[PDB]
Design an enzyme around this catalytic site. Structure first.
Site, PDB file in Angstrom:
ATOM      1  CB  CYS B  43      21.430  49.091  28.020  1.00 40.91           C
ATOM      2  SG  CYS B  43      22.672  48.861  29.370  1.00 40.91           S
ATOM      3  N   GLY B 117       9.189  56.877  15.328  1.00 43.11           N
ATOM      4  CA  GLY B 117       9.750  57.971  14.565  1.00 43.11           C
ATOM      5  C   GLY B 117      10.188  57.574  13.176  1.00 43.11           C
ATOM      6  CG  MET B 324      27.465  46.246  18.260  1.00 45.31           C
ATOM      7  SD  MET B 324      26.439  45.000  17.444  1.00 45.31           S
ATOM      8  CE  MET B 324      24.817  45.567  17.956  1.00 45.31           C
ATOM      9  CG  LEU B 325      30.548  46.900  24.450  1.00 44.88           C
ATOM     10  CD1 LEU B 325      32.044  47.058  24.831  1.00 44.88           C
ATOM     11  CD2 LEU B 325      29.930  45.769  25.256  1.00 44.88           C
ATOM     12  CG  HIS B 327      30.945  51.147  28.291  1.00 45.86           C
ATOM     13  ND1 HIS B 327      30.307  49.957  28.561  1.00 45.86           N
ATOM     14  CD2 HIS B 327      32.157  50.813  27.789  1.00 45.86           C
ATOM     15  CE1 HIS B 327      31.100  48.948  28.246  1.00 45.86           C
ATOM     16  NE2 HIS B 327      32.227  49.439  27.767  1.00 45.86           N
ATOM     17  CG  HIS B 450      48.293  45.710  51.762  1.00 41.24           C
ATOM     18  ND1 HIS B 450      48.700  44.741  50.869  1.00 41.24           N
ATOM     19  CD2 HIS B 450      48.207  45.097  52.969  1.00 41.24           C
ATOM     20  CE1 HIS B 450      48.838  43.589  51.502  1.00 41.24           C
ATOM     21  NE2 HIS B 450      48.562  43.780  52.782  1.00 41.24           N
TER      22      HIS B 450
HETATM   23  C1  FAD Z   1      21.230  40.410  27.245  1.00 42.64           C
HETATM   24  C2  FAD Z   1      22.008  41.638  26.813  1.00 42.64           C
HETATM   25  C3  FAD Z   1      22.963  41.986  27.798  1.00 42.64           C
HETATM   26  C4  FAD Z   1      23.806  43.108  27.615  1.00 42.64           C
HETATM   27  N1  FAD Z   1      24.799  43.481  28.630  1.00 42.64           N
HETATM   28  C5  FAD Z   1      25.603  44.612  28.384  1.00 42.64           C
HETATM   29  C6  FAD Z   1      26.589  44.990  29.421  1.00 42.64           C
HETATM   30  O1  FAD Z   1      26.667  44.313  30.452  1.00 42.64           O
HETATM   31  N2  FAD Z   1      27.393  46.120  29.181  1.00 42.64           N
HETATM   32  C7  FAD Z   1      27.310  46.909  27.956  1.00 42.64           C
HETATM   33  O2  FAD Z   1      28.003  47.867  27.771  1.00 42.64           O
HETATM   34  N3  FAD Z   1      26.332  46.523  26.931  1.00 42.64           N
HETATM   35  C8  FAD Z   1      25.516  45.399  27.181  1.00 42.64           C
HETATM   36  N4  FAD Z   1      24.553  45.050  26.184  1.00 42.64           N
HETATM   37  C9  FAD Z   1      24.487  45.883  24.921  1.00 42.64           C
HETATM   38  C10 FAD Z   1      23.712  47.218  25.114  1.00 42.64           C
HETATM   39  O3  FAD Z   1      22.405  46.870  25.437  1.00 42.64           O
HETATM   40  C11 FAD Z   1      23.769  48.023  23.830  1.00 42.64           C
HETATM   41  O4  FAD Z   1      25.133  48.235  23.394  1.00 42.64           O
HETATM   42  C12 FAD Z   1      23.126  49.363  24.054  1.00 42.64           C
HETATM   43  O5  FAD Z   1      21.826  49.175  24.581  1.00 42.64           O
HETATM   44  C13 FAD Z   1      23.040  50.116  22.757  1.00 42.64           C
HETATM   45  O6  FAD Z   1      22.576  51.423  23.080  1.00 42.64           O
HETATM   46  P1  FAD Z   1      21.820  52.249  21.921  1.00 42.64           P
HETATM   47  O7  FAD Z   1      21.413  53.586  22.473  1.00 42.64           O
HETATM   48  O8  FAD Z   1      22.767  52.445  20.758  1.00 42.64           O
HETATM   49  O9  FAD Z   1      20.620  51.349  21.362  1.00 42.64           O
HETATM   50  P2  FAD Z   1      19.412  50.607  22.098  1.00 42.64           P
HETATM   51  O10 FAD Z   1      19.748  50.308  23.574  1.00 42.64           O
HETATM   52  O11 FAD Z   1      19.148  49.275  21.392  1.00 42.64           O
HETATM   53  O12 FAD Z   1      18.140  51.603  22.140  1.00 42.64           O
HETATM   54  C14 FAD Z   1      17.512  51.929  20.881  1.00 42.64           C
HETATM   55  C15 FAD Z   1      16.116  52.535  21.175  1.00 42.64           C
HETATM   56  O13 FAD Z   1      15.619  53.025  20.051  1.00 42.64           O
HETATM   57  C16 FAD Z   1      14.082  52.534  19.970  1.00 42.64           C
HETATM   58  N5  FAD Z   1      13.770  52.752  18.584  1.00 42.64           N
HETATM   59  C17 FAD Z   1      14.343  52.092  17.551  1.00 42.64           C
HETATM   60  N6  FAD Z   1      13.842  52.617  16.390  1.00 42.64           N
HETATM   61  C18 FAD Z   1      12.987  53.623  16.740  1.00 42.64           C
HETATM   62  C19 FAD Z   1      12.196  54.445  15.927  1.00 42.64           C
HETATM   63  N7  FAD Z   1      12.134  54.499  14.496  1.00 42.64           N
HETATM   64  N8  FAD Z   1      11.418  55.384  16.465  1.00 42.64           N
HETATM   65  C20 FAD Z   1      11.356  55.505  17.843  1.00 42.64           C
HETATM   66  N9  FAD Z   1      12.109  54.673  18.658  1.00 42.64           N
HETATM   67  C21 FAD Z   1      12.923  53.720  18.073  1.00 42.64           C
HETATM   68  C22 FAD Z   1      14.139  51.338  20.420  1.00 42.64           C
HETATM   69  O14 FAD Z   1      12.825  50.927  20.957  1.00 42.64           O
HETATM   70  C23 FAD Z   1      15.167  51.440  21.616  1.00 42.64           C
HETATM   71  O15 FAD Z   1      14.563  51.776  22.781  1.00 42.64           O
HETATM   72  C24 FAD Z   1      23.727  43.881  26.433  1.00 42.64           C
HETATM   73  C25 FAD Z   1      22.773  43.525  25.470  1.00 42.64           C
HETATM   74  C26 FAD Z   1      21.944  42.425  25.646  1.00 42.64           C
HETATM   75  C27 FAD Z   1      20.888  42.028  24.600  1.00 42.64           C
HETATM   76  C1  FAD Z   2      43.575  45.416  63.474  1.00 45.35           C
HETATM   77  C2  FAD Z   2      44.538  46.194  62.604  1.00 45.35           C
HETATM   78  C3  FAD Z   2      44.011  46.281  61.286  1.00 45.35           C
HETATM   79  C4  FAD Z   2      44.734  46.962  60.280  1.00 45.35           C
HETATM   80  N1  FAD Z   2      44.215  47.067  58.911  1.00 45.35           N
HETATM   81  C5  FAD Z   2      44.986  47.753  57.954  1.00 45.35           C
HETATM   82  C6  FAD Z   2      44.465  47.862  56.555  1.00 45.35           C
HETATM   83  O1  FAD Z   2      43.379  47.327  56.291  1.00 45.35           O
HETATM   84  N2  FAD Z   2      45.255  48.551  55.607  1.00 45.35           N
HETATM   85  C7  FAD Z   2      46.540  49.165  55.954  1.00 45.35           C
HETATM   86  O2  FAD Z   2      47.213  49.748  55.148  1.00 45.35           O
HETATM   87  N3  FAD Z   2      47.029  49.051  57.338  1.00 45.35           N
HETATM   88  C8  FAD Z   2      46.248  48.359  58.278  1.00 45.35           C
HETATM   89  N4  FAD Z   2      46.774  48.259  59.603  1.00 45.35           N
HETATM   90  C9  FAD Z   2      48.102  48.927  59.891  1.00 45.35           C
HETATM   91  C10 FAD Z   2      49.317  48.100  59.357  1.00 45.35           C
HETATM   92  O3  FAD Z   2      49.252  46.898  60.017  1.00 45.35           O
HETATM   93  C11 FAD Z   2      50.625  48.800  59.674  1.00 45.35           C
HETATM   94  O4  FAD Z   2      50.648  50.113  59.094  1.00 45.35           O
HETATM   95  C12 FAD Z   2      51.776  48.009  59.113  1.00 45.35           C
HETATM   96  O5  FAD Z   2      51.732  46.690  59.605  1.00 45.35           O
HETATM   97  C13 FAD Z   2      53.111  48.627  59.468  1.00 45.35           C
HETATM   98  O6  FAD Z   2      54.138  47.958  58.716  1.00 45.35           O
HETATM   99  P1  FAD Z   2      55.638  47.973  59.318  1.00 45.35           P
HETATM  100  O7  FAD Z   2      56.466  47.155  58.370  1.00 45.35           O
HETATM  101  O8  FAD Z   2      56.147  49.394  59.381  1.00 45.35           O
HETATM  102  O9  FAD Z   2      55.499  47.474  60.839  1.00 45.35           O
HETATM  103  P2  FAD Z   2      54.979  46.090  61.426  1.00 45.35           P
HETATM  104  O10 FAD Z   2      53.892  45.420  60.551  1.00 45.35           O
HETATM  105  O11 FAD Z   2      54.401  46.388  62.800  1.00 45.35           O
HETATM  106  O12 FAD Z   2      56.192  45.037  61.441  1.00 45.35           O
HETATM  107  C14 FAD Z   2      57.237  45.301  62.375  1.00 45.35           C
HETATM  108  C15 FAD Z   2      57.978  43.952  62.587  1.00 45.35           C
HETATM  109  O13 FAD Z   2      59.146  44.188  63.191  1.00 45.35           O
HETATM  110  C16 FAD Z   2      59.300  43.068  64.338  1.00 45.35           C
HETATM  111  N5  FAD Z   2      60.327  43.619  65.179  1.00 45.35           N
HETATM  112  C17 FAD Z   2      60.217  44.772  65.883  1.00 45.35           C
HETATM  113  N6  FAD Z   2      61.416  45.016  66.503  1.00 45.35           N
HETATM  114  C18 FAD Z   2      62.260  43.997  66.142  1.00 45.35           C
HETATM  115  C19 FAD Z   2      63.596  43.757  66.514  1.00 45.35           C
HETATM  116  N7  FAD Z   2      64.450  44.556  67.350  1.00 45.35           N
HETATM  117  N8  FAD Z   2      64.257  42.693  66.033  1.00 45.35           N
HETATM  118  C20 FAD Z   2      63.603  41.806  65.194  1.00 45.35           C
HETATM  119  N9  FAD Z   2      62.280  42.038  64.845  1.00 45.35           N
HETATM  120  C21 FAD Z   2      61.621  43.146  65.329  1.00 45.35           C
HETATM  121  C22 FAD Z   2      58.109  42.977  64.794  1.00 45.35           C
HETATM  122  O14 FAD Z   2      57.933  41.649  65.400  1.00 45.35           O
HETATM  123  C23 FAD Z   2      57.169  43.079  63.520  1.00 45.35           C
HETATM  124  O15 FAD Z   2      56.916  41.853  63.006  1.00 45.35           O
HETATM  125  C24 FAD Z   2      45.985  47.562  60.586  1.00 45.35           C
HETATM  126  C25 FAD Z   2      46.500  47.456  61.899  1.00 45.35           C
HETATM  127  C26 FAD Z   2      45.784  46.793  62.886  1.00 45.35           C
HETATM  128  C27 FAD Z   2      46.306  46.653  64.332  1.00 45.35           C
END
Ligand code: FAD
Ligand code: FAD
Lengths: 481, 472
Positions: B43, B117, B324-325, B327, B450
């Site tokens: 890995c 080993g 064979m992964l 995790h 959100h």
């Molecule tokens: C290109 C590639 C990409 C991968 N991507 C992922 C991924 O994104 N996510 C994921 O979960 N898995 C991924 N895998 C799989 C992951 O590598 C294996 O599932 C994991 O490494 C297995 O862990 P392990 O401890 O069982 O064995 P291994 O990682 O194969 O380790 C075994 C160790 O034992 C050593 N050894 C063997 N025999 C002996 C011995 N007699 N004496 C002393 N040392 C020995 C070896 O040298 C080795 O170091 C990928 C594999 C490949 C080939």
């Molecule tokens: C720059 C900025 C960035 C933000 N980023 C996030 C974020 O990333 N994540 C998050 O969870 N929150 C974020 N917020 C907060 C989020 O916008 C508010 O919590 C949310 O919009 C409130 O929802 P609401 O439905 O209660 O009110 P509002 O979204 O304010 O809607 C109220 C609506 O009622 C209308 N209205 C009011 N009175 C009347 C009326 N008498 N008659 C008809 N229409 C009326 C208004 O025109 C308005 O459109 C951000 C706020 C700002 C200013």
């Protein structure tokens, strides 16, 4: 029929009338219709989707994604991978175009969904004119009456103004103006180091701006963020070139003759007066609930001191058939929070139970590195007198992170000592936003740190860092650190 | 001169090195034997790590060299490949991670013995070093983690020059003008896409009728193939290779035919990649002398505690049955040593995810439609396209979909299949769901952030459970 715009003024009958088409409102409307309610959604703006879609989540994430790649190409990253380029240049108009294209597609999508689900779209300004009546005023001065069993208020939020500083979306902008700047400002000041401010500040910094954020409080990232995470997040942003003046109040700002802006600042406690200059001033000190001209006073629905509509656990106002959800009520002002409140509210109208745990609502910051959390912070657990243990794993030790050569940050897990129950997950680094949803799922079942440690996470993935942090919390030690 | 140990691990791959670390953490006096110059096994040195590195780098090269960056306002006059530098980035990561394992052994007081080993007694392993020197370990338990090797293609000899295995393919000195891949499994698709991106004309030849190896959902596989073909990755499915000839001018002539028969033809290439499979490696380990027989495919038979027929000798990972992964090997190593210490031993191969790190990515966990049909299980289907997902659309990266398979009686999630962006990270939320025995409704009601790609997982589940999604 399904669109009632200017000229359409015949009275309508409905089971559910939703005022507002943001994340809360438009999902509530779709779901209500899917549940069999005759549903109307009123929106005053030209497009559906509210704050999130039109001036919020979507345009901001688009610029964050694009500016990150610009930084990858313009900086050292691509070079280190054997990708050689003579001259990398920014075309802001094109970048802005990509953003606008995504917004348009998604706004158009909501209209199709309304039509697909037989939701009646009324385009105008809604006002509640009776306990079972909403009146919509349209652009041409026309009015339309909707007689309705239930009313769902989803009128959302607005930008919180700063007294003495006038937003003109020219050189003194809100988030809306900052998302559409015509050129990279040489120097930018951001009032407010909350989530929105940090995101927008990072974007323009990447594109070449000299950026400073000024914050009255002593940390970045808004309310509820874990302090360790916030501090580490800040240190990382600072190394990127993002400057911070925490524990600082702004006393005023003056637009000068030469077009620049003088910001007067002082220590929050008082003392140490000084002035800092910029080309663009971004004001984002907060957002607040919007209920203007809704008819609440006449109905006798009083607001709480912060302008929110008080509701009970079924999201009912003091008038039992009138409901409110989303940014206009208490809780985290987030899109997915508004959406979930909308769904269960209308499920409740249809007779089901209604419960949501705000402790299971995740928060995400879409900078690079990302920040994400769900559940409790260390500060919260200490406040509540909860005995907990800690598990950490750095991304520097994660195989996918190391391979991508993208290794800032860590995962921190908080578990209860007695039961090993997961209490909080806090992620600073690559993929935080997607990863926190694995944690939200865990919290729903009241899963243990051991539970997650024993799940076979794919190798190599960023999620293995989440597995390992849980293993450390549960067993005391991780494998790979 | 001989070492006494509680647990002696033969092999330092994902299975072996994790098993060794854990055994030490549990208080076992632990030795790990590795014959290769570095730790980390297949890995780390010639597998997951180098392959994902080249996948990352060639993807970004494609983004810069092609249309993507231009569409986002990132304008570049002339993008060119420096292959030596790209290979260097790959090697740097392999080196950092191999070194990290060495430090982890030291930190956990695992004794590292370098040599080949061989089991020389019921309670003894002898390691022979390259110069012939020996180190004897007298030990209570033996853990076999000797992993796998490449499966050779009969009549075709790999020389890692013009006819390469995955090892040679990961280290080509230049982009081949034309390359043929024998085998359209995961490894073959990943390595082929890397070189196709860097400028090679690539064709994969596969005997079966689909790409992505065993267990992959057929709908998903066909959709994956179509997307890959539009990128320029060519396929000859239902095709058998009859032979390959190393020519005088250095090129290679590959003879192929229809799998059913009746369409002979020859095609020429500069590099031939042979990746038809991998097999368990147990050579000269001392098994025959002990009476430990292999199964017909070369695996070591083990019981539920991973014991061989000799109860103090164990085997885990690629040398035994199951996926064979990496995790999978890691988890078997952990629970094996937990079992030695007297604890429960559990792995569910149905909850072991698979990932293909192409772009788009592919990931799945649980059962496919073909499996559910085979088993006579009645199920319902939920789909959600990334085209309707807000983060995918915001990023302008909208290929593919999430497919959820649920059983009708209980709404239990039975399988999750993801084709598109973030599939690799996303499948782990799905692995957690299957382990907990989640219903489709459960996941639909969990509050996902959100805007995130995971919302497509939420919506696909909602569709399976309620019958309709919200945003599609
Ligand atoms: C290109 C590639 C990409 C991968 N991507 C992922 C991924 O994104 N996510 C994921 O979960 N898995 C991924 N895998 C799989 C992951 O590598 C294996 O599932 C994991 O490494 C297995 O862990 P392990 O401890 O069982 O064995 P291994 O990682 O194969 O380790 C075994 C160790 O034992 C050593 N050894 C063997 N025999 C002996 C011995 N007699 N004496 C002393 N040392 C020995 C070896 O040298 C080795 O170091 C990928 C594999 C490949 C080939
Ligand atoms: C720059 C900025 C960035 C933000 N980023 C996030 C974020 O990333 N994540 C998050 O969870 N929150 C974020 N917020 C907060 C989020 O916008 C508010 O919590 C949310 O919009 C409130 O929802 P609401 O439905 O209660 O009110 P509002 O979204 O304010 O809607 C109220 C609506 O009622 C209308 N209205 C009011 N009175 C009347 C009326 N008498 N008659 C008809 N229409 C009326 C208004 O025109 C308005 O459109 C951000 C706020 C700002 C200013």
């Amino acid at each position: 029929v399904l669109f009632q715009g200017p000229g359409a003024d015949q009275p309508i009958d409905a089971d559910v009338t939703v005022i507002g088409s943001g994340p809360g409102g438009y999902v509530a409307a779709i779901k209500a219709a899917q549940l069999g309610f005759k549903t109307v959604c009123i929106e005053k703006n030209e497009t559906l989707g509210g704050t999130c879609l039109n001036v919020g989540c979507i345009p901001s994430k688009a610029l964050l994604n694009n500016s990150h790649y610009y930084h990858m190409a313009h900086g050292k990253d691509f070079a280190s991978r054997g990708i050689e380029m003579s001259e990398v240049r920014l075309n802001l108009d094109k970048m802005m175009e990509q953003k606008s294209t995504a917004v348009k597609a998604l706004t158009g999508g909501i209209a199709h969904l309304f039509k697909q689900n037989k939701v009646v779209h009324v385009n105008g300004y809604g006002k509640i004119t009776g306990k079972n009546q909403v009146t919509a005023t349209k652009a041409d001065g026309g009015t339309q009456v909707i007689d309705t069993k239930n009313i769902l208020i989803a009128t959302g939020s607005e930008v919180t103004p700063f007294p003495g500083i006038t937003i003109d979306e020219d050189t003194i902008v809100s988030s809306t103006g900052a998302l559409s700047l015509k050129k990279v400002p040489e120097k930018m000041v951001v009032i407010g180091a909350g989530v929105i401010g940090v995101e927008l500040g990072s974007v323009w910094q990447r594109l070449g701006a000299d950026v400073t954020a000024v914050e009255f409080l002593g940390h970045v990232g808004g309310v509820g963020i874990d302090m360790e995470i916030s501090k580490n997040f800040q240190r990382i942003l600072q190394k990127q070139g993002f400057k911070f003046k925490l524990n600082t109040k702004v006393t005023g700002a003056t637009k000068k003759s030469d077009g620049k802006i003088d910001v007067s600042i002082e220590a929050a406690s008082g003392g140490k007066a000084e002035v800092i200059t910029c080309d663009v001033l971004l004001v984002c000190i907060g957002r607040r609930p919007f209920t203007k001209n809704l008819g609440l006073e006449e109905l006798g629905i009083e607001l709480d001191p912060r302008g929110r509509i008080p509701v009970n656990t079924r999201f009912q106002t003091k008038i039992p058939n009138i409901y409110a959800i989303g940014d206009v009520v208490a809780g985290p002002m987030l899109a997915h929070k508004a959406e979930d409140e909308g769904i269960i509210c209308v499920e409740g109208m249809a007779g089901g139970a209604v419960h949501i745990d705000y402790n299971c609502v995740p928060s995400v910051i879409y900078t690079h590195p990302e920040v994400a959390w769900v559940g409790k912070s260390e500060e919260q657990l200490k406040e509540e007198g909860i005995e907990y243990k800690v598990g950490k794993f750095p991304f520097a030790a994660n195989s996918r992170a190391k391979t991508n050569a993208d290794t800032d940050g860590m995962v921190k897990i908080l578990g209860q000592k007695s039961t090993d129950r997961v209490l909080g997950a806090h992620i600073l680094g690559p993929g935080a936003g997607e990863m926190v949803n694995e944690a939200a799922l865990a919290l729903e079942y009241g899963a243990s740190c051991e539970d997650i440690a024993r799940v076979c996470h794919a190798h190599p993935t960023l999620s293995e860092a989440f597995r390992e942090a849980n293993l450390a919390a549960s067993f005391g030690k991780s494998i790979n650190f």
